Amino acid sequence: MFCFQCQETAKNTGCTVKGMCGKPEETANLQDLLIFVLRGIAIYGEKLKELGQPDRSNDDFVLQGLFATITNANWDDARFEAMISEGLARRDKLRNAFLAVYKAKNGKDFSEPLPEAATWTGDSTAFAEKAKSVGILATENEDVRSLRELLIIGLKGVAAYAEHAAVLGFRKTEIDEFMLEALASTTKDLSVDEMVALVMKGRRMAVTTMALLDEANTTTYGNPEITQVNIGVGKNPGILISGHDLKDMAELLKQTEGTGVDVYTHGEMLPANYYPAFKKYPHFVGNYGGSWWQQNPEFESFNGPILLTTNCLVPLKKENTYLDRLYTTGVVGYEGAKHIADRPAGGAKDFSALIAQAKKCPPPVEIETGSIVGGFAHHQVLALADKVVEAVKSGAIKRFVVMAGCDGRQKSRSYYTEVAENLPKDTVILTAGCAKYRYNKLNLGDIGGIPRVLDAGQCNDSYSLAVIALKLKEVFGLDDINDLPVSYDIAWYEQKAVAVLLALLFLGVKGIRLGPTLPAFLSPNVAKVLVENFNIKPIGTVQDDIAAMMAGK
Ligand code: SF4
């Protein structure tokens, strides 16, 4: 196999026998073959748009297919075989439409050569062998490989955010058209300048898509507000919901009201505690446990059913006993785990089976007690603008440090905890995404009643951090966003974090520290281009980086 798309890839070069995440050869190769089929849909879809007869019938299929290949999302080979079969049939419908329109507009049959993605077919028995030959290493030139895979990695992150928006009813044609432009590009031989341009365009579309999801979440469920979240447990059986989808949360809360089963959040569902729409349910207890990678012991101790709405789902250990109470939904899948089917239009998912099961389970084991504060998204922070700005002016807040991003397993990540603890007492940490769990249960106190850690929400709520920085720039009358008293020390793990990075580069932020390693998917020449344009830096020692940031450097 070959896969290099997350931070934990083997030796920082590539997983080649079995993924460090657990992904086996056969599953890794089926994901490659699905991306191959998606490029084939994109070739005809782009050509039909060119001829003035665009077809939007595959928009959701393309989003879900890219999302299913994100790290820790879907582990069920049968699901990939089904999507590959469906994708071939969708591609062939587009092919037939294109051939007829081409002939009508040109007065002859189309006769130009097309990439294999556009033509190959087989039944399911052919998939495993074909899959070996269509993967990342088929691109021989290392710099073309880096730029193609960088684009597809960023695109997957954008597609995940766009899928959440689409679930809530919010779509922009430009985003779905871009998916096809980008995928089709990876079958063409383009200049370096053209490939870099498409990566920057993806950063631009990450801004558009994060804006759309911010609008969808806040219009539907309200603006986030300051909230104290309980981290201990109650005395009823519960259901634990993980992942990122807020519409699944809204339906779960409604269906559980009055049943004597409590609801708890986990991981990137923490921010659901912050939304006005959800705060009105008494049986919504609080947040259980820590970061995604600690899930095996914590899902075990939770005792009740667990529902994964998105990544990250980690494979069970041999000793784990919770398979019979693990449920997947959306693009998530796992062999042997029960799957909750998609809602009909205008209707809702059916969670009745989880509720029935939970009534049979013991209450959760308590793993800690106390509370966390959060809810500082853009509406809430702008409401406090006078106070924050005032505090900057007196020098009580000397610097903001953005420590948003995504967490992971490696021991080097203690760097982020130790930075948080050793920053000076007149600084404030801005965060979003599961990187927060490295420091959100420390007591770092406050400055004048502003908490020293301000949690804006899920990784997608990095958008709020940009909106805040743009406003401060206007208030202080600076010509360049980079001259604000803000430093960026961002941790990454999977492809949504890459989309957030591309958005920050599109907005012109330079001097970002990215860690705890730099991506394996940057070749030397491509890394140079990003360094010289954007001044991205690796992390150093805790002491050395703190001194540097406090200096604006
Ligand atoms: S998703 Fe990450 S750890 Fe898993 S196979 Fe790919 S690079 Fe390796």
Side-chain angles (χ1 to χ4, degrees), residues 503-523:
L504 298 169
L505 304 179
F506 182 88
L507 296 168
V509 176
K510 302 185 62 231
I512 288 164
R513 279 170 173 86
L514 179 71
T517 59
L518 303 180
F521 47 87
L522 297 183
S523 71

Side-chain angles (χ1 to χ4, degrees), residues 359-371:
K359 277 183 183 190
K360 300 155 160 212
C361 295
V365 176
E366 182 156 83
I367 51 195
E368 65 204 331
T369 61
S371 69

Side-chain angles (χ1 to χ4, degrees), residues 12 39 45 76 100 102 120 175 178 199 219 226 236 281 351-352 370 377 385 393 458 504 551 553:
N12 208 19
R39 286 184 184 110
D76 185 347
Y102 182 95
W120 175 87
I175 296 164
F178 185 71
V199 170
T219 291
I226 296 166
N236 293 311
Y281 294 101
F351 289 129
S352 62
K393 283 198 172 149
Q458 303 175 126
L504 298 169
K553 302 198 159 166

